[PDB]
Amino acid sequence: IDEKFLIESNELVESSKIVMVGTNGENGYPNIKAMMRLKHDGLKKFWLSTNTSTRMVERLKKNNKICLYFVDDNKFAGLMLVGTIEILHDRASKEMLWTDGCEIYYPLGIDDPDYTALCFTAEWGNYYRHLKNITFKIDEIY
Amino acid sequence: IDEKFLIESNELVESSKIVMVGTNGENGYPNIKAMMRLKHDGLKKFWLSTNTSTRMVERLKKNNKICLYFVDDNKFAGLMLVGTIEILHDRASKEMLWTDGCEIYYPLGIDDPDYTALCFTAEWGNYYRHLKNITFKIDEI
Ligand SMILES: [Cl-]
Ligand SMILES: [Cl-]
């Protein structure tokens, strides 16, 4: 509950545009994919970008329990957040979340058929560091 | 399945000291944790260490289906392996897998009570590059 974590975890989040996203894959195996962080609100909410794959979409439709992971291997520190994700289908949201260097990935702009936007809402997390971890609920850390 | 994207998969694995490990967690949620690579054999077998944790031991005994993810540090790309994991509780295995480098995390050595070794066996791979992925079965390649 010390203020350092939220600030330290926030630096961790801010330090890369890439987030590792864990999902429930086929046949009971977890799957991890890299996604792009379009926006976040502290540790409460993340808006992410990934390529439209019917596989991923169908999977998230049936099971939206996910986790996010942020790491710096140099400190051997990481942050994991656990929560649920929803696909944002409306163009309004897609437009408001669009950023520079979305363009690198989605040449046809907001209307690129491969631009999918997601909203992750964190329930809890775990900060790992010095081979220990501190688990917290989001509603506590604020 | 071609040898270009599999040469990059192996290079990525050989350069990796830390690997992201995805496990099936409480209440239906995936969980991810960084673990250290001790040894591997191609893309089929990976020996990992992490700190001893009774929560993780119980998790993995209920459900040993996991994935590994190797981040490419120089471009938007990565390798995901999927398979099953087993904890190596025996000192013989821990002695064999011990590498110079472990002394940083486990200062009491092979007998450090926080030293846990695990053996992952991959069944399927997925290589991500250029916003695409190629899926392959490890035993075919
Ligand atoms: Cl709206
Ligand atoms: Cl020595």
> At residue A123, what is the residue type?
E
Cα separation, B23 vs B139, whole angstroms:
22
Quote the Cα angle for A19-A80-B84, to 5°.
Answer: 90
Return phi, psi of residue B5, to 5°: -75, -20
> What 3-state DSSP class applies to A57?
helix
Cα separation, B110 vs B99, whole angstroms:
10
Give strand pairing partners of B133. B128
Do the bridges between strand B132-137 and strand B65-71 make them parallel or antiparallel, or are there none, so unpaired? Answer: unpaired
A51 to chain B, any CB pair closer than 8 A? The answer is yes
Give strand pairing partners of B10. none
Cα separation, B85 vs B64, whole angstroms:
5
Q: Residue A126 in contact with residue A134, Cβ under 8 Å?
A: yes
Q: Residue A124 in contact with residue A50, Cβ under 8 Å?
A: no
Element (H, E) at A62: helix A54-62
Chain-centre distance of CA B73, in angstroms? 17
Cα separation, B68 vs B82, whole angstroms:
6
Q: Which B residues in the span 68-87 are in contact with A, Cβ-Cβ below 8 Å? A: 69, 71, 76, 78, 80, 82-83
Q: Residue A109 in contact with residue A79, Cβ under 8 Å?
A: no
Return phi, psi of residue B71, to 5°: -75, 130
CB contact under 8 A, B33 and A80: yes
> At residue A140, what is the residue type?
E
Q: Residue B40 in contact with residue B48, Cβ under 8 Å?
A: no
For residue B20, give the nearest of A51, A65, A69 by CB distance. Answer: A69
> What 3-state DSSP class applies to A10?
helix
Give chain A's count of helices (H) and strands (E): 3, 7
Compute, in degrees rounded to 10, the torsion defined by CA atoms A32, A33, A36, A42: -10
> At residue A13, what is the residue type?
V
Contacts of residue A58, Cβ cutoff 8 Å, sequence gap at least 6: none
Structure-solving method: X-ray
Quote the Cα angle for A63-A9-B52, to 5°.
Answer: 75
Return phi, psi of residue A90, to 5°: -85, 140
Decide: residue B44, CB within 10 A, 0-12 exposed, 13-18 middle, 19+ buried.
middle
CB contact under 8 A, B30 and A24: yes
Q: Residue A8 in contact with residue A54, Cβ under 8 Å?
A: no
Q: Residue B117 in contact with residue B94, Cβ under 8 Å?
A: yes
Q: Residue A88 in contact with residue A54, Cβ under 8 Å?
A: no
CB atoms within 10 A of CB B9: 23
Decide: residue A24, CB within 10 A, 0-12 exposed, 13-18 middle, 19+ buried.
buried
How many residues in total does chain A contain? 142
DSSP B34-48: EEEEEEEETTTEEEE
Closest to B34 (Cα-Cα) out of B17, B46, B47, B53 = B17
Cα separation, B97 vs B115, whole angstroms:
11
Residue matched to tokens 């964190």: A122
Decide: residue A14, CB within 10 A, 0-12 exposed, 13-18 middle, 19+ buried.
exposed
- Set out the domains of chain A in order of their start, with CATH numbers: 1-142 (2.30.110.10)
- Residue A130 Cα to ligand 2 midpoint, Å, equals 24
DSSP chain B: --SHHHHHHHHHHHH-SEEEEEEE-GGG-EEEEEEEEEEEETTTEEEEEEE--HHHHHHHHH--EEEEEEE-SSSSEEEEEEEEEEEE--HHHHHHH--TTHHHH-TTGGG-TTEEEEEEEEEEEEEEETTEEEEEEGGG-
> What 3-state DSSP class applies to A95?
helix
The CA R_g of chain B, rounded to the nearest whole Å, is 15
Cα separation, B99 vs A42, whole angstroms:
39
Contacts of residue B94, Cβ cutoff 8 Å, sequence gap at least 6: B88, B110, B115, B117
- Residue B100 Cα to ligand 2 midpoint, Å, equals 6
CA-based nearest residue in chain B for residue A114: B131
DSSP A101: T
Quote the Cα angle for B12-B51-B17, to 5°.
Answer: 15
DSSP A17: S
Cα separation, B79 vs B10, whole angstroms:
9
